[PDB]
Design a protein around this ligand. Structure first.
Ligand code: UDP
Ligand code: NAG
Length: 506
């Protein structure tokens, strides 16, 4: 490549990803619009799914995607198109019968000692994402497929448990490119046939060098656990930007003489002299971080404010908004405190029996949330919707609720106001203070460090009730759209263009 390329580095991606991954997807949308060459690199081993299925889901174009382990081969990022028949060709013939159970297809043979389990992309299609080969009860090999087999895993029995010892990655023609020798989940040795790498760091270094980075390239680092030093070192011949996503230090641990950074930034902040610029989503975080660099460190890095999201256009309700309908959208994670919202809604429902509350997202808090709902017999008006595509969802509702105690930005807050939702949330930095004008487009609720649950639920309940009882909904929605005009894609393109124009040239 001769053209400027923007390389973006993250660990992983899933069906129900965090805002970090969605922010990357927003950024990809911007780079496409600016007709700029970009790559989004993921460094995690992802085998449970075809990585292309995940990236396409979130909206990356296939040619914007680099997967670390695939990169050294000539197999392109692609959807799974291998069939059951294609799969069975890798294993010996003579099928006796099958068993199907959803996506799990087990193919039995007359050789009673062997069977193949296929894991289908779609229960009602014959596309096979990966397959498992079992001999006399023992798992021996797993193959992984896109348009051909790109990876095999090799297993041997120990105490009757299958132990992974080797992973091999292939080229299109079926020849192996490299083997990873495994030890209890650690990728210890990467054997490239004519050379060898010891440890993932060395492997990632080789990857970085394989990019042939030019001075006019930009490396943007989103997440970096395990690989920071190698990325930092190899990015010096290009330009290096670090995106700060969440709150970046611990207030409770910090005092006049000592600061405790967020673990995901400690490395980057310690070595800020190696970073060309940091990116933050709000000016308040910008100023906070700048001050802390001056107060606690010997660095004075460049820090630019670029929102991680933008709104293409405001979205109007297409068929109207259900009366008294409430929405929240997040990972079901402790730091979002959706349980406080559920209890608040149960309470407000005493005064407004028409209230409903839909909860979008996935996460380990689902068990607690179901328990609270069951305990109050609230199933008919409070529901978990799962992780969904939200673009058409928000404008079907009246008001958005958040009990998150901290947001670097909060993409669902931006998305919510872009669809004309008033917001009710805690008066906490940074996102809530960016997106909520108390009394104009919703309410900011004072937060306390002791976090008394009874007080919290009473406050949210009171505020929800007040919005409806004082007839504030029309005015607040209108004000949300007004705030949202400050977060439109047109503005953001210019911010990126400007930043890109400054890394290109000087
Ligand atoms: O059911 C859901 C819930 C969330 N999201 C997306 O996940 C991202 C969450 O980002 P945010 O900044 O709100 O929270 P984070 O997960 O970063 O704390 C947003 O872009 C949402 O649109 C989604 O697509 N479907
Ligand atoms: C809890 C928290 O701070 N989450 C931040 C979010 O506010 C921000 O929108 C996103 C994308 O930058 O990074 C997140 O993970």
């Amino acid at each position: 490549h001769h053209h400027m390329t923007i390389y973006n580095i993250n660990l992983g991606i899933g069906w129900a990803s965090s805002g970090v991954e969605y922010a990357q997807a927003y950024r990809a949308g911007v780079f496409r619009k600016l007709n700029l060459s970009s790559k989004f690199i993921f460094t995690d081993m992802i085998l449970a799914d075809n990585i292309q299925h995940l990236t396409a889901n979130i909206g990356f174009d296939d040619n914007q995607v680099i997967w670390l382990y695939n990169h050294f081969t000539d197999i392109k990022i692609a959807p799974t198109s291998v069939t059951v028949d294609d799969v069975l060709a890798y294993f010996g013939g003579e099928e006796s019968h099958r068993e199907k159970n959803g996506k799990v297809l087990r193919v039995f043979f007359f050789d009673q000692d062997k069977f193949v389990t296929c894991y289908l992309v779609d229960e009602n299609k014959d596309l096979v994402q990966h397959a498992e080969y079992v001999f006399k009860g023992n798992l021996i090999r797993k193959d992984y497929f896109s348009y051909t087999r790109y990876c095999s895993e090799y297993f041997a029995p120990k105490d009757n448990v299958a132990v992974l010892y080797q992973r091999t990655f292939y080229n299109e023609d079926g020849t192996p490119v490299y083997d990873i020798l495994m030890n209890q989940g650690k990728e210890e040795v990467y054997h490239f046939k004519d050379k060898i790498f010891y440890g993932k760091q060395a492997f990632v270094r080789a990857f970085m060098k394989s990019l042939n980075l030019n001075k006019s390239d930009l490396v943007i680092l989103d997440r970096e656990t395990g690989i920071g030093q190698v990325v930092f070192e190899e990015a010096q011949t290009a330009h290096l930007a670090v995106v700060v996503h969440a709150e970046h230090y611990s207030e409770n641990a910090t005092n006049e003489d000592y600061i405790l950074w967020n673990n995901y930034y400690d490395y980057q902040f310690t070595n800020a002299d190696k970073v060309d610029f940091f990116i933050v989503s709000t000016d308040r975080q910008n100023e906070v971080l700048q001050e802390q660099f001056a107060k606690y460190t010997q660095h004075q890095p460049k820090i630019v404010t670029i929102p991680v999201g933008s709104i293409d256009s405001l979205t109007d309700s297409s068929q109207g908004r259900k009366p008294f309908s409430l929405i929240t959208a997040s990972r079901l994670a402790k730091e979002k405190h959706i349980d406080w919202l559920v209890k608040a809604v149960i309470e407000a429902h005493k005064e407004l029996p028409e209230l409903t509350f839909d909860i979008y997202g996935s996460g380990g808090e689902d068990s607690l949330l179901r328990e609270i709902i069951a305990n109050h017999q609230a199933e008919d008006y409070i529901q978990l919707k799962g992780h969904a595509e939200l673009s058409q969802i928000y404008s079907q509702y009246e008001v958005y609720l958040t009990a998150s105690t901290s947001e670097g930005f909060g993409l669902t807050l931006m998305e919510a106001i872009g669809s004309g939702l008033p917001l009710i949330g805690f008066d906490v930095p940074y996102g809530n203070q960016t997106f909520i004008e108390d009394g104009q487009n919703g309410y900011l609720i004072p937060s306390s460090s002791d976090h008394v649950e009874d007080q919290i639920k009473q406050a949210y309940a009171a505020k929800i009730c007040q919005l409806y009882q004082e007839n504030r909904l029309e005015a607040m929605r209108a004000y949300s759209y007004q705030i949202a005009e400050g977060f439109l894609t047109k503005e953001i393109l210019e911010k990126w263009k400007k930043t890109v124009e400054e890394v290109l040239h000087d």
